[PDB]
Design an enzyme around this catalytic site. Structure first.
Site, PDB file in Angstrom:
ATOM      1  N   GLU A 175      21.837   2.288  15.919  1.00 56.78           N
ATOM      2  CA  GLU A 175      21.558   2.647  14.532  1.00 56.78           C
ATOM      3  C   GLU A 175      21.916   1.437  13.703  1.00 56.78           C
ATOM      4  OE1 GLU A 175      22.621   2.838  10.979  1.00 56.78           O
ATOM      5  OE2 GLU A 175      23.838   4.640  11.273  1.00 56.78           O
ATOM      6  N   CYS A 220      24.967   2.600   5.327  1.00 52.97           N
ATOM      7  CA  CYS A 220      23.625   2.379   5.832  1.00 52.97           C
ATOM      8  C   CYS A 220      22.617   3.243   5.079  1.00 52.97           C
ATOM      9  CB  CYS A 220      23.566   2.681   7.326  1.00 52.97           C
ATOM     10  SG  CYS A 220      24.579   1.552   8.310  1.00 52.97           S
TER      11      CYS A 220
END
Lengths: 516, 516
Positions: A288, A322
């Site tokens: 990720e 993020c």
């Protein structure tokens, strides 16, 4: 079900005197323990090293929060041996017994939650609610994965029967793997990345981010107290690329679970694709890798609601997420009303030492500070600076909430992940153009739309190409179980955390047929 | 459900006069069409090229069974453009309509089964029942994936609700990808590899194996007749690495589905791990890469049953199967009784032109012949040749069923995939040693155990590390739906074909949250 249905752990707001009192005491005790040393954890024991790693307080970097041992190749090699040895028996625990161990760890983590929150405040500069949200998410991952793991227990595979035969298909765990964790959610994501694979019978060697080694050690104190067998989980803090690269490239590493920067994620995925000398499998790599996340606002939106959600999304934990809103895409009719509201809200945000519970603490390190300030200088030649853009006074890494406007969609500050409190505002004609601009980055993690027009929301549902899309609310803070979390494109491999599908990544299937 | 429950398509045994007459008629029609030329299929049309590829009858290699066009980079590029253009709308077809298209294709394939079987006989040297099994499996993949795809239609993701919010998680297809297919099941595996991704909304560029381009073209005739929209499926026969390499490495290839040799699979997996210039995603690569499959027999087994299953497993389609028994591991008490029975059965196998329905046809090509003969020479220096080991008379690539005994477990012929009619026999002390030997290869695809001892079967269930394990029956011929097919270790990525899990590989998940 043998346990109560999953519910998300409440996030503490500290608006009661009871909660404030408990938090003040937790902060005081963590502060009083500054300087403590935490060893590695390998094969069920705390193992010290000659070299040490230092963890600083980003709100006051002359202060050492703690030190840890430093893992090298020899320690990585020992961890791999321990993890594979443990795997031989851990894989054969009944699932209910592995899940019970997780639930015990969750109970222990819950009982130390104020302490863990206070450690986040000091070690990574989270304010109080950001710290509470992090620990709550970590508890959620444990509670959720413990329950989800049961869904893979035999029998779990639908097969077509055949006359005169017994056909059994079932899942088995992969083996010993490596977790490489980020500093921005160093309780939550660290915990989830480890506990998901472990729940279903894998063993894990975990490498915490350098900036968050102390709180990683405290999570391991919990794993140890819970009673995970020697080798099932291992803790290898380390400086730079040495131990991480060694583990990723090792022929005996079965899988790699990574959350962090795109630059590192790309290297890991490439390395995982190679057959190391003597390697006897195809490595799985789950990565990720961040985002350049936008919130679109059109002229039908509740502008006050939108401005608030934008400020929360852009500046929560100093934009070091993020999922953070780093782009604000405004249609022509929305531009002035929304930008004015965002500026009025953002200019009132407080910045200071995290222990004081400001709106924003410091960014996490001197290197992060240098990067964010560097992007601000770049932004000055790309867009129009209209708020902040400065380092504030203080020893801590304090950066003011920053806004650039009239930013070209292809500008570096509109394309590259800054991971700091820097919002780029882009003006477009209409909703169609807003979607085009939203999609035109290499990423695809989170996105939002503020709009009352049902047709625009439906349009976004189909066309706004992000893994986690939000309508009329903030785009950060995905809740375990509620919003499976993970992205598209260069935001990673779409490994949806906090979802049933996550655990499938750490299993392979065996089919056994007997003809009678 | 809107259609009848899945059942496997019957495999024709040709025990009736009508079935034999029908096959003879099909063989006649197919050979009358040996002069046919088949173009590429791109964007819904047959597209010819200046250069051509020739397909030979391996039972009579001076006889041409057809020619095809030959794809190059320009055609690969055109196919990618067509596939992505098609994807834009194909992704949004209701699942029931995509599934109905598959069902139409299955019905058309079923009506042409004898023709396809006859084409297999002449183009790749399958005897009649091997040909029938192949076509039946192809029909099964279509019928199965059409039904399986429905299981992923919205709503299919279990989520935890949150107050005041609507939380929707759903699957979307990935995009345009590449299929690289094998010559040994060039109807079945070719079809399943294409139809799985296509069923759930992806588009596919398919490269058939050079040795089986004609039958690949005939499958495409079925896809065209069924009415898949232009660009949804594309057919690119090609010579050598050019087209496959180009597609695998291309920045706009979303996924790669490969079945074939380990050598090629390793290269594809490594390439898929790399970010090509301008690439905006992490490629998915599913690889199934062969095996060195063993059958264990202990002294409790039905020795006659074991010998029959061993011969079928070792020599069916001349051993040219990823699932073929290439190792026979015999405990000391089983050694002489089983070896004697295997030798007596194997020495009675007929070898000849595939159309005559011999036990063995020819191997597929001069190159395969060279490889198999080379391994026989290697075997002569490693073990003891006790049966066969020779090229037989005829232009066709006829190789006798071959048995080596006293083969050391680490010998090349006991470790490397020969993909020919060559069985290696290894004598072990007991069942524990049998399992040790069975596991000590880089592979893990299929395995079998003949034993009546229940505790030995359970032991194997736990410890014989192969993705498809069989007790007291042949280890080839996994049926769609019944035995999810796919291996461990260097047998590939465990992409279980003919199982619900297969389709998940070709989907990503989006989570959309609305706060009211």
């Amino acid at each position: 079900m043998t346990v109560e249905p999953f519910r998300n752990e409440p996030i503490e707001t500290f608006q009661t005197e009871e909660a404030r009192r408990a938090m003040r005491e937790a902060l005081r005790r963590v502060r009083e323990e500054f300087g403590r040393h935490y060893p590695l954890y390998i094969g069920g024991e705390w193992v010290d090293t000659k070299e040490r790693m230092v963890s600083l307080n980003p709100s006051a970097p002359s202060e050492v929060v703690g030190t840890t041992a430093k893992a090298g190749k020899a320690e990585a090699e020992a961890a791999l041996e321990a993890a594979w040895k443990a795997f031989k028996t851990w894989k054969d625990w009944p699932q209910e017994d592995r899940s019970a161990l997780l639930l015990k760890a969750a109970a222990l983590m819950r009982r130390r939650k104020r302490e863990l929150e206070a450690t986040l405040v000091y070690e990574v500069g989270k304010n109080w609610v950001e710290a509470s949200a992090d620990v709550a998410e970590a508890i959620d991952f444990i509670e959720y994965y413990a329950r989800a793991a049961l869904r893979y227990r035999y029998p779990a595979v639908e097969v077509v029967p055949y006359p005169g035969e017994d056909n059994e298909s079932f899942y088995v765990p992969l083996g010993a793997g490596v977790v490489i964790a980020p500093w921005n959610f160093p309780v939550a994501i660290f915990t989830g990345m480890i506990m998901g694979p472990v729940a279903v019978g894998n063993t894990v060697i975990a490498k915490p981010a350098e900036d968050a080694v102390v709180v990683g050690a405290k999570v391991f104190e919990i794993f140890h107290e819970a009673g995970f067998p020697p080798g099932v989980v291992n803790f290898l803090p380390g400086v730079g690329e040495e131990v991480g690269a060694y583990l990723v490239e090792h022929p005996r590493t079965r899988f790699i679970n990574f959350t962090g920067s795109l630059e590192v994620g790309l290297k890991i995925y490439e390395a995982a694709g190679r057959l190391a000398p003597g390697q006897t499998w195809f490595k799985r790599a789950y990565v990720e890798t961040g985002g350049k996340d936008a919130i679109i606002v059109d002229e039908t939106a509740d502008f006050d609601l939108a401005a608030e959600g934008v400020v929360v999304s852009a500046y929560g934990f100093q934009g070091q997420k993020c999922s953070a809103a780093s782009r604000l895409i405004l249609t022509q009719g929305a531009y002035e009303p929304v930008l004015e509201r965002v500026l009025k809200r953002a200019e009132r945000l407080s910045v200071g030492p995290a222990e004081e519970n400001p709106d924003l603490g410091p960014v996490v390190s001197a290197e992060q500070e240098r990067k964010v300030l560097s992007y601000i200088e770049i932004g000055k030649n790309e867009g129009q600076l209209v708020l902040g853009g400065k380092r504030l006074e203080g020893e801590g890494y304090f950066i003011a909430p920053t806004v650039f406007t009239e930013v070209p969609p292809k500008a570096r500050i509109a394309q590259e992940e800054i991971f700091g409190p820097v919002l780029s505002v882009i003006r477009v004609k209409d909703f169609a153009e807003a979607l085009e601009v939203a999609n035109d980055t290499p990423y695809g993690l989170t996105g939002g739309v503020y709009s009352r027009k049902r047709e625009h929301l439906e349009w976004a549902r189909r066309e706004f190409h992000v893994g986690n899309l939000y309508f009329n609310r903030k785009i950060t803070g995905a809740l375990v179980g509620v919003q499976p979390f993970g992205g598209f494109k260069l935001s990673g491999t779409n490994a949806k955390t906090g979802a049933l599908d996550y655990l499938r990544l750490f299993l392979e299937m065996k089919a056994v047929a007997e003809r009678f």
